[PDB]
Design an enzyme around this catalytic site. Structure first.
Site, PDB file in Angstrom:
ATOM      1  N   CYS B   1     -16.192  36.030 -39.418  1.00 49.04           N
ATOM      2  CA  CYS B   1     -15.237  36.385 -40.486  1.00 49.04           C
ATOM      3  C   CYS B   1     -15.725  36.632 -41.778  1.00 49.04           C
ATOM      4  O   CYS B   1     -17.061  36.278 -42.065  1.00 49.04           O
ATOM      5  CB  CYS B   1     -14.288  35.459 -40.612  1.00 49.04           C
ATOM      6  N   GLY B   2     -15.161  37.766 -42.414  1.00 46.56           N
ATOM      7  CA  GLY B   2     -15.690  38.153 -43.734  1.00 46.56           C
ATOM      8  C   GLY B   2     -15.289  39.362 -44.424  1.00 46.56           C
ATOM      9  O   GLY B   2     -14.619  40.071 -43.753  1.00 46.56           O
TER      10      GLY B   2
END
Ligand SMILES: Cc1cc2nc3c(=O)[nH]c(=O)nc-3n(C[C@H](O)[C@H](O)[C@H](O)COP(=O)(O)O)c2cc1C
Ligand code: F3S
Lengths: 1472, 81
Positions: B1-2
């Site tokens: 995630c990011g």
């Protein structure tokens, strides 16, 4: 596939009903489609009564108190993935049930077993639950059911409002329950173990299994629905849905109340045809009617104008036909009200339905007559169901009603006789209208200026209008359409050229309008619409017309009858309007008509007679479409009518489109004016103007019936306003905004292009001085007219290149043919790869590519024998396959000649007429072929003139010399997809080496049909185009029917690759292929083999004369006389060189691209681009729909299997393992076995063995005899040869004796059965279809279409059905009983004897081509005597023995039916 | 995630913007959900400016006339069955 019902007559529940229902479901697996998985099905369902004791014990177990009144149970499908949508659905259901006051007992999870469902059907399995609702308000049962229905509808609406998917309610009632799913039929009681309980007892049960055409199961799409069960398909759903949308805005009933407002959109979205029909059935039943009345009103009988029906039934049928539009189509229905249980048929009776009454007060009906085992000593009466028939059971009173008794009981409720008299006709009004007020015929200059404004040439009046008035039938062409499409043209093409008609593939049968004409009606009703839930006399007070088209006098009379209640609207726009005048005029007229219909007007007449040199006429199609759609969207179409006055209608395709768009009546005055102007000049001869007008109207009516019958619609009321066409070259937005329901895969011109075209033509016609109409080229090539695909120089250089055998002039030919401006859709495509070129010598050899080219089939009746033989020798020399077409072939050419040239054909065809099919004709090929529809005339049977049938063709086709032969449009064997699967099974059983090919015609929706036929174990598909050749066919079916083959090819390829089925079948195309570029493009689209056709005809001498139907072709290609056949100059070397150069050219192309084999290009669509014709045409054709590239995944893009798709073995295998001395030493054999309905084609492989060993007539009759005891399967003894004798004890299902070829079949009841042989059905429908020799003795009554297409067989039966002995050709048929309507229709040879005791043959016979008289010659008495004696000896009958006993007094009861063409050809004349 | 973004301060459309965006997407796998089949992701996306020249050259290859103002494009997910 199959539907059936079981009912207890007295009405007392018992377990045996459900047990027999399950047993019947366990014996239908043979008709369905098997799968490699072994677990995947396509739907099964049972429908029974609620086991009150079961759920009462359940409630007791929970802890509550068992109520007194009847309990209610609902079954629901909830979503399974998410755990929150289930809570929303439960909350909605609970807040809607408790809003009425009923008490909820609780939910229950149905115990299931997911171990037996397949993988794909398990990915969409919903969560099945049940809710138990009790009645505490003490309300009666009928109000309880009404409240439950209203609650269910409101629940459905509320759940739709929140956009929750995967939610369904299988049933909600206190009377019945439904268990349905996506499993196999035999695994039903395993998935739902509840049904194995001892407490599920009922007094009625319905069971159904279906046959899907794809491989994506949707659980809510399984049958039975709520209060219906359907087998077949409905042809008219796009018209019935719109008429429902018009009837909704005025229906209301005091039974529902305010909740009526919550019932307005009666037909939701996402349902099938049967689903919508079911919703309508249920909403009509819940309002007061009964199941028989609703069945009568929705699918009525054929209102025949005969004296065989009492007048009460006639008044009833008149009422029911006047109140509502019929739902036509192949349909076998088994429906059940809360009280009645009804089983019925459609109008034509295409599907079979047979019932059986037992001594236990149990009736069992279904599709097959042997599904449930019953001791023959315990039956009372067997029967069947004809067209429009129905059989009902009243459970409350415990009575059984057959057809006539139910009709007489239903014709007593209301006095319809005094009601029907409210109607008035138009013929009487035209008669009372005295001949005054004759208006002056327009000027010759005015007429010419008005005809030029629409682009009418002189050939449109010299070629296609003269025959209509001279004889009464349209013209006849003899070649395919090689003209560019409308949008690609540069001349003025009318708007009606953009619309192609429809037809029916294997999914639906076309209707024969020449023989089965008694079920086609063209009635029209003005002032007909009203409340469909009321019972009064105001519903049948209206005006009635006998045809939609009218003349000038009839139109004026109708206008005087209408009076001041009609409102006329202009349909013209100013030439000086601007760039957006047409859209403004459309908005203006669509607003004025809405404002006028609100102001009390009940009649709208859309006139354009104000057309002058300052106002251009709106194309009538566009105007009527806009007005009809705007009235539909405004809830106003139910109030008024729509009459159109046009100045363009000349042909039969115009009125068809105008009526399909939505118009009620159409008036064409310019045509009548031109007819009068041509008659006053003395061109028609001595015939008056009135006779010419009558002939013209008759031609228009016959053309309308023919266009309507290509689809299967028999009534004009349900066809009007359905949008039964396809637009090609029109923009998506325009057709979506103005036309009800039509698809346009590729966009086209908007309104600006149409306005430009109309203004250009109007200016050319009105601004210059016109002296005459141009010659024009649309049907013949002219220098001033349109361009053609086959011009003069191109044929000349092609013949030169093929004759002189030089590749250079062939390259010049290719250049000259691919240099012209764009004419077809494959001209806009542009080949562009990305690799580096390679040398031309390293690509695959020519033989390896010439082995991929096939020549299509061309009948021996159309072509001359020399040309056919030359083609067959030329194609067998290089290694490719030829085709023989329909009409059979010469058996003497079954062997190679001394020269080494083989005149045989590698591909035999199986047409619809079955003109030469035998057991030896089907064992002399390497690949069979099923021709469903032809590329030139789709949805029609081939023609052959009466002078083209010489004595040779007569003896080859087993027909009458000098009689016109027209094959039936349908097959009488392919009425649905499972019938096609059965026929493929038969063809694969009779020939253990050949493949089966299905030929289709390109149109929209062919993808689903191709996906369905692939599951039927076919292995080669052939998609033809709309530009294919023909022998003899009307010009309208040539020009306005079909689609380009690119659409069909791309769509079939995509659909097959989408359903994981592409790796099982091969693809083949033809139509307009001339060069190698076309071959490369077609191979890039997905094909693997290619057909050429007409080009070969040009290589043999054809010069495009287009006179093959007249038997006067100059070169001698399509002729039958001798002095012109002598002029033949064909040579096989020509065809060989043509194929050689064709392979050379594609080798060059492949070398230029960069590949080395055709296998590397098939499916690679990404190598094609779309180039525009420039920035000056402004045509928005978007070809991305045919450039979409679906990815296959793991499997290849072509067929990767060797040999045909194998099929399971039937009983015959064992026979071959036992009758070994018959083949090894040639001795007599006597075998005995047991037959069942799950064993098809008994006695077919043995026939092939005998044919290959000895021959068709190599054995004496009765050499090998077999005895079966029990109900035999389908296609019993098909294609049997002489020397085989089958004897059945019991009965046969269907297609018995199909294609008999010398065998002998005997059907009789068992010896211990208490049945009158002459009062019970023993064989099914389509008996002796296309037989050529043999015998058949039955001891019962036949089904429908008995002895169709007989050629040499002999049959003796004790009864018959409707349409019997239709289109017979030769043999003898003795019928010891009653016959049905339309008997001996189209008979052109043979003889028949009818044993009439009620003196009722003159009412049932079709006295058009035959004559019926009495026996007066001893020579014709001895034949009958010997035939009946042989029948008695064979079947040991008792009725026929009685007739033989009292011969002296019974010889005077026989009618002899003899054709008319065979009155002066017999040896012994019938007369003295 | 990011989540991440890259912006040129002056206003040059340039290739290094998309270069660095793709390079950044290629260095997030350690935060994502390690899976067994090795192919099923959980959702990824990039958002960039419309390359007028690309679509204008495409329309030219089709055969139309490229306009002067900015062209517009729309991306659609249609049903597949
Ligand atoms: C003279 C002639 C006779 C034909 N006879 C038959 C026929 O009997 N049965 C059939 O299915 N198709 C028949 N066809 C159509 C061909 O099978 C094929 O569809 C057509 O020739 C393809 O057109 P093309 O040559 O332009 O490619 C006939 C065509 C012609 C020109
Ligand atoms: S068009 Fe037909 S009539 Fe003979 S010359 Fe050619 S085959």
């Amino acid at each position: 596939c199959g539907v059936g019902f079981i009912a207890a007559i007295d009405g007392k529940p018992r377990r045996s009903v459900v047990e027999k229902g399950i047993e019947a479901l366990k014996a239908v697996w043979h008709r369905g489609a098997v799968d490699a998985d072994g677990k995947t099905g396509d739907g099964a369902g049972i429908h029974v009564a609620v086991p009150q004791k079961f759920f009462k014990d359940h409630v007791k177990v929970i802890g509550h108190r068992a109520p007194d009144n009847k309990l209610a149970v609902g079954q629901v499908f909830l979503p399974r993935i998410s755990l929150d949508a289930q809570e929303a659905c439960r909350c909605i259901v609970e807040t809607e049930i408790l809003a009425f006051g009923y008490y909820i007992y609780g939910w229950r999870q149905v115990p299931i077993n997911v171990d037996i469902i397949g993988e794909k059907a398990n990915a969409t399995r919903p969560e099945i639950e049940q809710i138990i609702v009790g009645n505490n308000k003490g309300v009666s049962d009928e109000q309880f059911e009404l409240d439950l229905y209203i609650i269910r509808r409101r629940i459905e609406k509320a759940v739709k409002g929140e956009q929750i998917n995967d939610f369904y309610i299988c049933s909600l009632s206190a009377r019945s329950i439904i268990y349905k799913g996506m499993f196999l039929a035999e695994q039903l009681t395993t998935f739902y173990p509840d049904l194995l309980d001892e407490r599920f007892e009922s007094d009625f049960a319905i069971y159904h299994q279906r046959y899907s055409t794809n491989t994506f199961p949707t659980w809510p799409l399984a049958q039975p629905f709520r209060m219906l069960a359907h087998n077949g398909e409905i042809n008219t759903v796009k018209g019935n849905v719109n008429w429902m949308k018009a009837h909704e805005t005025r229906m209301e009933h005091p039974a529902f109340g305010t909740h009526m407002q919550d019932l307005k959109p009666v037909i939701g979205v996402g349902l099938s045809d049967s689903g919508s029909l079911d919703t309508v059935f249920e909403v009509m039943v819940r309002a007061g009617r009964t199941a028989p009345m609703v069945k009568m009103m929705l699918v009525p009988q054929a209102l025949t104008s005969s004296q065989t029906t009492p007048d009460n039934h006639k008044a009833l049928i008149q009422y029911c036909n006047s109140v509502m539009e019929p739902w036509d189509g192949p349909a076998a229905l088994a429906m059940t009200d809360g009280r009645w249980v009804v089983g019925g048929m459609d109008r034509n009776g295409l599907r079979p339905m047979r019932y059986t009454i037992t001594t236990d007060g149990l009736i069992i009906g279904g599709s097959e007559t042997g599904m449930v085992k019953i001791d023959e000593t315990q039956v009372i009466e067997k029967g069947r169901l004809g067209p429009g028939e129905m059989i009902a059971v009243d459970l409350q009173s415990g009575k059984l009603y057959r057809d006539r008794e139910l009709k007489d009981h239903l014709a007593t409720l209301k006095p319809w006789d005094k009601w029907v008299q409210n109607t008035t006709h138009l013929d009487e009004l035209v008669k009372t209208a005295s001949l005054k007020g004759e208006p002056s015929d327009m000027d010759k200059a005015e007429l010419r200026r008005r005809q030029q404004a629409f682009g009418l040439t002189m050939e449109d009046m010299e070629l296609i209008l003269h025959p209509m008035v001279e004889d009464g039938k349209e013209a006849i062409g003899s070649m395919g359409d090689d003209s560019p499409i409308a949008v690609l043209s540069d001349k003025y093409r009318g708007l009606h050229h953009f619309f192609r008609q429809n037809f029916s593939q294997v999914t639906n049968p076309p209707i024969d309008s020449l023989r089965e004409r008694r079920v086609m009606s063209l009635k029209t009703r003005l002032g007909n619409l009203g409340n469909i839930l009321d019972e009064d006399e105001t519903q049948t007070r209206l005006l009635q017309l006998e045809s939609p088209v009218l003349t000038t006098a009839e139109f004026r009379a109708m206008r005087d009858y209408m009076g001041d209640t009609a409102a006329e609207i202009d349909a013209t726009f100013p030439v000086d309007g601007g760039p957006e005048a047409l859209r403004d005029a459309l908005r203006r007229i669509r607003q004025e008509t809405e404002d006028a219909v609100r102001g009390g007007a009940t009649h709208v007449i859309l006139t354009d007679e104000a057309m002058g040199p300052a106002r251009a006429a709106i194309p009538a199609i566009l105007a009527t479409g806009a007005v009809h759609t705007h009235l539909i969207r405004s809830n106003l179409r139910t109030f008024t009518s729509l009459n159109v006055r046009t100045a363009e209608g000349l042909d039969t395709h115009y009125f068809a489109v105008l009526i399909g768009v939505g118009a009620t009546t159409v008036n064409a005055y310019l045509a009548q004016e031109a007819i009068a102007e041509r008659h006053r000049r003395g061109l028609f001869g001595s015939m008056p103007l009135e006779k010419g007008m009558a002939n013209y109207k008759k031609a228009i009516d016959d053309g309308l019936l023919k266009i309507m019958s290509k689809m299967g619609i028999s009534v004009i009321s349900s066809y009007r306003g359905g949008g039964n066409f396809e637009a090609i070259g029109l923009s998506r937005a325009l057709v979506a905004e103005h036309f009800p329901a039509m698809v346009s895969r590729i966009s086209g011109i908007g309104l600006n292009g149409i306005q430009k075209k109309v203004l250009e033509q109007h200016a050319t016609a009105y601004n210059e001085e016109v002296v005459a109409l141009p010659v024009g080229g649309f049907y013949r090539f002219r220098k001033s007219g349109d361009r053609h695909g086959w011009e003069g120089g191109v044929i000349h250089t092609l013949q030169q290149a093929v004759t002189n055998d030089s590749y250079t002039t062939f390259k010049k030919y290719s250049e000259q043919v691919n240099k012209r401006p764009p004419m077809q859709l494959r001209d806009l495509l542009e080949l562009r790869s990305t690799k580096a070129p390679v040398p031309v010598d390293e690509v695959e050899s020519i033989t390896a590519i010439r082995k991929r080219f096939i020549t299509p089939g061309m009948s021996m009746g159309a072509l001359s024998p020399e040309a056919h033989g030359t083609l067959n020798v030329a194609m067998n020399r290089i290694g490719a396959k030829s085709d023989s077409g329909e009409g059979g072939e010469d058996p003497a050419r079954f062997r190679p000649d001394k020269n080494g040239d083989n005149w045989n054909s590698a591909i035999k065809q199986v047409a619809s007429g079955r003109f030469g099919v035998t057991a030896e004709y089907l064992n002399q090929c390497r690949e069979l072929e099923i021709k469903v529809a032809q590329g030139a005339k789709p949805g029609e049977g081939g023609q052959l003139p009466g002078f083209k049938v010489t004595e040779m063709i007569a003896r080859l086709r087993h027909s009458t010399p000098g009689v016109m032969l027209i094959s039936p449009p349908p097959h009488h064997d392919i009425y649905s997809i499972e019938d096609l699967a059965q026929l493929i099974y038969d063809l694969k059983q009779i020939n253990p080496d050949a493949k089966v090919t299905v030929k289709l015609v390109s149109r929209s929706g062919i993808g689903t049909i191709a996906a369905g036929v692939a599951k039927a174990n076919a292995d080669i598909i052939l998609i033809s185009g709309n530009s294919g050749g023909t022998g003899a066919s009307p010009q309208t079916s040539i020009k306005f029917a079909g689609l380009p083959w690119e659409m069909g090819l791309s769509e079939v390829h995509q659909v097959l690759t989408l359903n994981r089925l592409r790796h099982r079948v091969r693809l083949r195309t033809d139509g307009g292929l001339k060069t190698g570029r076309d071959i490369v493009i077609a191979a890039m689209l997905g094909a693997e083999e290619f057909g050429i056709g007409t080009a070969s005809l040009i290589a043999m001498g054809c010069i495009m004369v287009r006179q093959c139907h007249s038997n006067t072709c100059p070169v001698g290609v399509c002729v039958q006389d001798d002095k012109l056949r002598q002029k033949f100059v064909g040579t096989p070397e020509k065809v060989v060189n043509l194929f050689t150069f064709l392979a050379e050219e594609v080798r060059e192309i492949l070398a230029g691209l960069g590949f080395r084999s055709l296998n590397e290009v098939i499916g690679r669509t990404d190598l094609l681009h779309q180039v525009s014709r420039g920035a000056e045409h402004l045509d928005d054709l978007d070809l991305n729909p045919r450039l979409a590239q679906v990815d296959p995944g793991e499997n290849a893009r072509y067929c990767t299997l060797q040999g045909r798709n194998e099929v399971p073995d039937t009983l015959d295998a064992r026979i071959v393992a036992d009758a070994r001395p018959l083949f090894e030493e040639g001795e007599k054999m006597q075998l005995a076995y047991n037959a069942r309905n799950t064993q098809r084609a008994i006695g077919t492989r043995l026939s092939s063995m005998v044919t290959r060993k000895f021959g068709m007539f190599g054995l004496q009759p009765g050499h090998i005899t077999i005895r079966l005891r029990g109900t035999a399967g389908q296609s019993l003894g098909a294609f049997a040869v002489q020397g085989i004798k089958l004897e059945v004890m019991g009965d046969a299902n269907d297609y018995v004796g199909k294609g008999l070829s010398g065998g002998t079949i005997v059907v009789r009841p068992t010896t211990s059965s208490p049945l009158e042989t002459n009062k019970n059905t023993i064989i099914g429908n389509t008996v002796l279809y296309g037989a050529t020799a043999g015998k058949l003795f039955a001891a019962g009554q036949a089904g429908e279409r008995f002895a169709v297409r007989n050629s040499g067989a002999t049959v003796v039966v004790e009864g018959c059905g409707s349409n019997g002995c239709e289109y017979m050709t030769g043999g003898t048929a003795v019928i010891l009983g009653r016959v049905g309507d339309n008997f001996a229709a189209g008979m052109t040879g043979g003889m028949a004897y009818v044993y009439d005791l009620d003196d009722s043959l003159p009412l049932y016979i079709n006295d058009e081509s035959v004559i019926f008289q009495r026996i007066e010659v001893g020579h014709y008495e001895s034949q009958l005597k010997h035939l009946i004696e042989e029948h008695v000896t064979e079947t040991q009958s008792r009725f026929a023995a009685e007739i033989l006993n009292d011969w002296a007094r019974e010889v005077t009861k026989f009618w002899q039916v003899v054709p008319k063409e065979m009155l002066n050809r017999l040896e012994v004349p019938v007369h003295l």
